[PDB]
Design a protein around this ligand. Structure first.
Ligand SMILES: [Mg+2]
Ligand SMILES: [Mg+2]
Ligand SMILES: [Mg+2]
Ligand SMILES: [Mg+2]
Ligand SMILES: [Mg+2]
Ligand SMILES: [Mg+2]
Ligand SMILES: [Mg+2]
Ligand SMILES: [Mg+2]
Ligand SMILES: [Mg+2]
Ligand SMILES: [Mg+2]
Ligand SMILES: [Mg+2]
Ligand SMILES: [Zn+2]
Lengths: 50, 38, 326, 112, 223
RNA sequence: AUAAUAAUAAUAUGGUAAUAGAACAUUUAAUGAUAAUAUAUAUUAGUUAUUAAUUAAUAUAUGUAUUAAUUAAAUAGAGAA
RNA sequence: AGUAUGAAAAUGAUUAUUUUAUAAGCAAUCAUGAAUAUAUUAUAUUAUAUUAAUGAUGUACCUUUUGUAUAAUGGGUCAGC
RNA sequence: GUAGAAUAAUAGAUUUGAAAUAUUUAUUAUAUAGAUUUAAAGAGAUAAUCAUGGAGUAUAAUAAUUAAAUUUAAAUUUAAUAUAACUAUUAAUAGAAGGUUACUAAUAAAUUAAUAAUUAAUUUUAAAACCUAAAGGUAAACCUU
């Protein structure tokens, strides 16, 4: 089918170890979560500083 | 449910510019109900 | 809505704040951590537990605008605004002063004629911030690394909070390797140091009249007991000249380096032993792989001898004519 | 006749990659082609230029495709009637897809 | 009707991954920015302890990365061959030659190497170069940081009948070549710097060096 | 008049064939709280006189143990055919 | 010869740390420099981990035997049984 | 954001002591004597990366219905059930097509009960090539009557 369907080469990747990508991404996610939580906490504090 | 899938020129409709087209997927009757706003 | 949880939490927070403002004695007594600390360091009983609590409380008046950027690195959700009249800020200064005096004095006693720079270095080693922090850690002064909300949820009393160290610590400060650089006020080490200083200050306050030297004794037991090899502190430019100058200043014949023993000349690794004589009195032995090196070493040795002289307690306080200048 | 023991990983490695003889050298000997500044092996004609020349020769010295005299004016319908196109066998098909099993000469990089 | 379509390409990208670089993909925005700043400060590469300031605001940071993370971040391109019909050993015979070579040099070498696997290797290298070009990096900066052979999947064992009743089992191996190309601008420079640092650290050879008196004392002076 | 732990004094503690006594791992059945801040498995570093288990960090599951423990049983432990 | 999943090992290539081109033997153990890595109490004159400087000690394992480094038996390695 | 104080670094100005253990303090050449040392083509160990391989682990129509449990009225889990496993026991009931290749080898009702279509039970009814020891042969799916 002129390659319009089926396997599409690979994209121009950089090298990232498989078991390191898992780690780093997870860490990032955790950090994000923490940030959200931190924000919430700050908001709460603001509310009860009167 | 309408999935967007890349289709050959063989199965092209008169208009499709890109190979990319949206087409309907089938649904089980168990997952859809009758209307009549009901 | 049978339960107004926000209200209860608010109340709890208020209570905590009140306690902090007061540092009630009863509450302090109830705290286990504080008690343990008191026992550990064998503090005088005149020192109350309220005082101890105060010592662990660093000045945190108003929450910064750096909080509002948790997206930008920092978030301060652990601390609760302190009372301005009941912080460790005053005590801390006093403690610092004490450390500066006493340690320095001790050093002087140990080693008259200690070049001023070297003395300063020694003092720093004895009571630098880092060292103080380490000491605090050893003692067991832990930091309040738990949000107020979290504490409330846990349902822990205020006693525990009192027991912990309290300052504006950045919750989420080294996460994902990002560290928000801030002033001295928000560092843990600094806080620890302050706490240590505050304890000393407190001790001084309690034992200013009944036993004045008690504080000093305590310091000696804790701060001055620590090993520091003063020999490792020196570094000379061209010592020979300095030595000569010293000799000139004193009533000594001009110093001359002379070969005492020599082996393995014409080799990868020779050994030359040179003494620096002043007439007959040998002023510094010096070994070396080269002659020059040996000479240098001798000079250095002589300088060390001159400086690190440690007189006895039975002697009459010796006062040096400062440092040699050339 | 026969190995007394399984040859250890070390030993085999050192037999194989150890000596110089067994290693591939780097082809230092290569230089610019005078006609188009591409890389070519030293003391050797550039494979592109020569190929091009050959092609041109072929184009010029092309033999006349001897087309039959009859089939040129042979009606399309008539042709169809005569010579109907059969289905080729698997083998024939395979043979026909030359691209699958046949290699075209690669072009070098430009020397600098 | 002409097409190869942008939408299609986008879809393909979505299916696999974005073309973006590792430094961009792995790190969280702020962190990424910080990293970039650090790199700018220290000429291309990350440095162990450098208090950096963002261009926009007046806040300052100190970035702390583990070795592995650092290694990953420095811009790379990863290229993979298809199922080459050759044996690992044969491949590695060539691949040992292309160790730390500049990609172009390696390609040139491949071109003139009279080994069948060489063609495919060259092709792979070309592909890698193309990818690099697409994603940020310039051909003349790319070197082969490391390149290796794996066995590919399902080798088919055949019986090979010998004289008398004897039976060999022939196996037809298929492999794949993978390479990682990094950049002489950043990664190589960084490693050079590291080397220099190490050298600086190195204690000098002293003739009468204080070599420790090895052994136990015994609770008794021998001097 | 027992058990558990700790002392003091003493005597004893190599071991093939073999006899005797006591434990642990694994899996199944009976009873059985609990919980994604939990669990299971894995890697690394610790801890307990340590074929075992536990702690911390990390990775992958999984809305979660035939889980702790006591019994009952075994296709119950492998460098040796 | 179900489907998912799969950092189980043996096995291959590659990179890093380290040791190695005057050295001779179950490849370990004990001693013992040096180099590197990690560590939010390395306060250090720190602690662990990795590593064939160097020294000493050290005839694989099973089976069967009066007795085995034996040049007596058995095993290419790993996984499952 | 501005101003003032404490300390640190850098630069300048003004003083400063000194023939400074310069026949080596800092550092550069060459010579003559000695003395040593520094490899990595490849390798070992450890780790990691990319493989190979498929042990281990999970799961067994994942629907529908039933009951319970948990959250907001729907979902999730638990246990049971299928036309869709075998094995052992116990209890009940009963004593039954394969192949081959083609001119492919099909169905039609009625009555009774349940509620015109209906499902069930009880029934009658059409088709159904060739071969599978004994119309009679043969080399099964062919031939001969
Ligand atoms: Mg596979
Ligand atoms: Mg033959
Ligand atoms: Mg073979
Ligand atoms: Mg015994
Ligand atoms: Mg068994
Ligand atoms: Mg086994
Ligand atoms: Mg065993
Ligand atoms: Mg023997
Ligand atoms: Mg054998
Ligand atoms: Mg080396
Ligand atoms: Mg016949
Ligand atoms: Zn040319």
């Amino acid at each position: 089918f002129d390659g319009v369907v089926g396997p599409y080469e690979r994209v121009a990747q950089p090298f990232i170890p498989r078991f390191l990508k898992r780690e780093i991404d997870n860490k990032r996610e955790r950090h994000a979560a923490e940030l959200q939580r931190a924000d919430k906490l700050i908001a709460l504090n603001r509310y009860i500083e009167d | 449910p309408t999935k967007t899938v890349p289709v050959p020129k063989q199965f092209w409709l008169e208009g499709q510019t890109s190979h990319m087209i949206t087409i309907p997927v089938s649904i089980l009757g168990k997952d859809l109900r009758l209307v009549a706003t009901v | 809505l049978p339960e107004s949880e926000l209200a209860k939490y608010k109340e709890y927070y208020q209570g905590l704040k009140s306690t902090v403002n007061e540092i009630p004695e009863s509450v302090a007594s109830k705290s286990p951590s504080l008690r343990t600390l008191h026992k550990r360091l064998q503090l005088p009983n005149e020192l109350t537990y309220s005082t101890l609590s105060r010592c662990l409380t660093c000045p945190s008046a108003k929450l910064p605008d750096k909080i509002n950027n948790p997206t930008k690195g920092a978030a301060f959700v652990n601390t609760v605004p302190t009372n301005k009249y009941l912080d460790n800020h005053g005590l801390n200064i006093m403690g610092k002063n004490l450390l500066s005096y006493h340690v320095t004095k001790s050093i002087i006693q140990k080693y008259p004629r200690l070049p001023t720079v070297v003395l300063n270095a020694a003092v720093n080693a004895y009571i630098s911030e880092a060292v103080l922090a380490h000491i605090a850690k050893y003692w067991g002064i832990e930091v309040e690394t738990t949000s107020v909300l979290s504490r409330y949820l846990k349902m822990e009393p205020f006693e525990f909070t009192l027991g912990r160290l309290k300052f504006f610590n950045n919750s989420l400060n080294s996460k994902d390797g990002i560290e928000l650089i801030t002033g001295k006020n928000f560092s843990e080490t600094s806080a620890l140091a302050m706490s240590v200083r505050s304890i000393i200050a407190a001790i001084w306050a309690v034992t200013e009249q009944k036993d004045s030297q008690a504080v000093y004794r305590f310091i000696d037991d804790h701060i001055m007991s620590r090993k520091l090899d003063i020999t490792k502190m020196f570094q000379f430019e061209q010592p020979t000249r300095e030595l000569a100058m010293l000799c000139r200043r004193e009533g000594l014949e001009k110093p001359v380096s002379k070969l005492v023993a020599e082996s393995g000349r014409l080799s990868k690794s020779p050994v030359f032993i040179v003494h620096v004589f002043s007439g007959e009195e040998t002023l510094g032995e010096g070994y070396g792989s080269s002659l020059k090196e040996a000479k240098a070493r001798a000079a250095t040795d002589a300088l060390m001898k001159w400086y690190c002289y440690e007189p006895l307690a039975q002697q009459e306080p010796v006062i040096d004519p400062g440092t040699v200048v050339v | 006749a026969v190995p007394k023991k399984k040859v250890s990983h070390q030993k085999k490695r050192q037999k194989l990659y150890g000596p110089g003889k067994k290693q591939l050298k780097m082809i230092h000997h290569l230089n610019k082609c005078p006609s188009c500044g591409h890389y070519k092996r030293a003391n050797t004609l550039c494979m592109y230029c020569v190929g091009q020349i050959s092609h041109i020769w072929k184009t010029h010295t092309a033999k006349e495709e001897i087309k039959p005299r009859q089939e040129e004016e042979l009606s399309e319908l008539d042709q169809r009637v005569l010579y109907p196109g059969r289905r080729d066998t698997k083998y024939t098909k395979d043979l026909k897809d030359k691209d699958n099993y046949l290699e075209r000469r690669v072009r070098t990089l430009k020397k600098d | 009707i002409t097409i190869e379509d942008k939408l299609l390409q986008q879809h393909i990208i979505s299916l696999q991954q974005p073309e973006q670089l590792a430094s961009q993909s792995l790190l969280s925005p702020l962190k990424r920015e910080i990293y970039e700043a650090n790199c700018k400060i220290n000429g291309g590469f990350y440095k162990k302890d450098t208090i950096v300031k963002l261009p926009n605001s007046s806040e300052r940071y100190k970035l702390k990365l583990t070795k592995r993370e650092i290694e990953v971040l420095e811009p790379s391109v990863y290229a993979q061959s298809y199922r080459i019909k050759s044996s690992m050993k044969k491949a590695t015979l060539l691949l040992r030659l292309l160790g730390g070579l500049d990609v172009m040099k390696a390609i040139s070498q491949c071109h003139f190497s009279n080994k069948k696997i060489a063609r495919e290797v060259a092709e792979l290298l070309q592909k890698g170069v193309k990818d690099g070009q697409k994603l940020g990096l310039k051909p003349e900066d790319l070197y082969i940081s490391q390149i290796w052979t794996g066995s590919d999947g399902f080798w088919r064992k055949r019986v090979e009948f010998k004289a008398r009743t004897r039976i060999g089992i022939i196996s037809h191996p298929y492999i794949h070549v993978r390479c990682i190309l990094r950049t002489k601008s950043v990664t190589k420079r960084r490693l050079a710097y590291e080397a220099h640092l190490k050298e600086q650290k190195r204690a000098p050879w002293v003739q009468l060096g204080d070599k420790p008196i090895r052994g136990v004392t015994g609770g008794v002076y021998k001097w």
